[PDB]
Amino acid sequence: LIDFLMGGVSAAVAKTAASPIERVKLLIQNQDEMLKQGTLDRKYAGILDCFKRTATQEGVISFWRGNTANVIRYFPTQALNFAFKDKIKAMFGFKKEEGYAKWFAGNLASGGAAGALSLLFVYSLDYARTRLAADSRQFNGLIDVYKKTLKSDGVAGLYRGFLPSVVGIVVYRGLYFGMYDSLLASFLLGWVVTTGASTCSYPLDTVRRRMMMTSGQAVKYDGAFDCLRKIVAAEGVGSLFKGCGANILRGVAGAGVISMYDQLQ
Ligand SMILES: C=C1[C@@H]2CC[C@H]3[C@]4(C)C[C@H](O[C@@H]5O[C@H](CO)[C@@H](OS(=O)(=O)O)[C@H](OS(=O)(=O)O)[C@H]5OC(=O)CC(C)C)CC(C(=O)O)(C(=O)O)[C@H]4CC[C@]3(C2)[C@H]1O
Numbered sequence: 001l002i003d004f005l006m007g008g009v010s011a012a013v014a015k016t017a018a019s020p021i022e023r024v025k026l027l028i029q030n031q032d033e034m035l036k037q038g039t040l041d042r043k044y045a046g047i048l049d050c051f052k053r054t055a056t057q058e059g060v061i062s063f064w065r066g067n068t069a070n071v072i073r074y075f076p077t078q079a080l081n082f083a084f085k086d087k088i089k090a091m092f093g094f095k096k097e098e099g100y101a102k103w104f105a106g107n108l109a110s111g112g113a114a115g116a117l118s119l120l121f122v123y124s125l126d127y128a129r130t131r132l133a134a135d136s137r138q139f140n141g142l143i144d145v146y147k148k149t150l151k152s153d154g155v156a157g158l159y160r161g162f163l164p165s166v167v168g169i170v171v172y173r174g175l176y177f178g179m180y181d182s183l184l185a186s187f188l189l190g191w192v193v194t195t196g197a198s199t200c201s202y203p204l205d206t207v208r209r210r211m212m213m214t215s216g217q218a219v220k221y222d223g224a225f226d227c228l229r230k231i232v233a234a235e236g237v238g239s240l241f242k243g244c245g246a247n248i249l250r251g252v253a254g255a256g257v258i259s260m261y262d263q264l265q
Pocket residue numbers: 077081085111114115118119122164165167168169172173176201202204205208
């Protein structure tokens with residue numbers, strides 16, 4: 001019971017620390033949708049630009065907007081973890097001695113299973129986190145997001161982009177473990193691997209988040225592939241990678257921060 005709460009706090013620290021660079025990343029990633037929704041007046045020039053305008057127009061507190069969602073995200077996930085993660089690992093898991101391909105495939109399957117299982121209960125918090133991040137306001141808080149989204153689109157409005165998120169989880173896990181196996185030291189390895197994996201899986205996250213953004217709007221995408229097609233055709237392939245640099249920055253920040261807090265505890 002105590003260890004649970006301590007874990008909660010422990011990740012709350014990391015998420016809260018990484019919050020300012022996260023919102024900038026989310027802003028750059030989702031700016032076209034905000035432009036469609038008349039929430040943003042002009043496209044951002046880049047990271048520095050977004051930081052500047054957001055600071056001068058919203059303030060300093062704004063960089064932590066939506067972060068409470070990230071904080072309270074810990075508690076429902078871990079309850080599902082403790083209850084199902086071991087059992088799920090038991091069904092697919094392998095030692096590499098039993099065969100590398102079996103180990104890898106079982107790892108993808110297990111990560112995907114546990115992942116989808118968590119998201120089935122937790123996705124809406126991610127949705128709210130995103131919607132609150134992307135603003136300049138349209139929503140007032142978590143409860144407002146839930147109430148309004150349910151009012152317009154209902155439950156499905158809260159879970160939009162679920163499938164590319166699951167696909168994203170599997171892809172990311174595969175790249176992560178693959179690179180981690182193919183390869184001051186720990187920080188290096190972790191950073192490089194997480195970077196490669198997050199970058200290669202980044203378009204799925206863009207599709208996911210923008211689909212989230214379409215909630216509460218008359219115009220929506222007709223599937224993840226449809227979103228992909230439209231974004232590419234109108235804005236270019238690079239549009240799928242908007243905010244990726246900021247996301248990497250978020251990674252390098254987060255790793256150091258969580259290491260420091262672990263050292264402090
Ligand atoms: C399409 C995408 C992109 C790629 C996949 C995901 C994650 C990276 C996917 C990542 O997925 C994490 O991957 C880790 C490495 O495999 C894995 O750790 S491990 O099993 O011990 O090895 C985590 O599992 S857990 O049991 O420890 O908790 C797993 O998180 C989850 O499965 C919980 C879900 C609620 C997400 C979690 C997460 C993270 O940045 O870390 C997070 O939710 O914070 C995602 C961000 C959103 C995207 C980005 C999703 O939009």
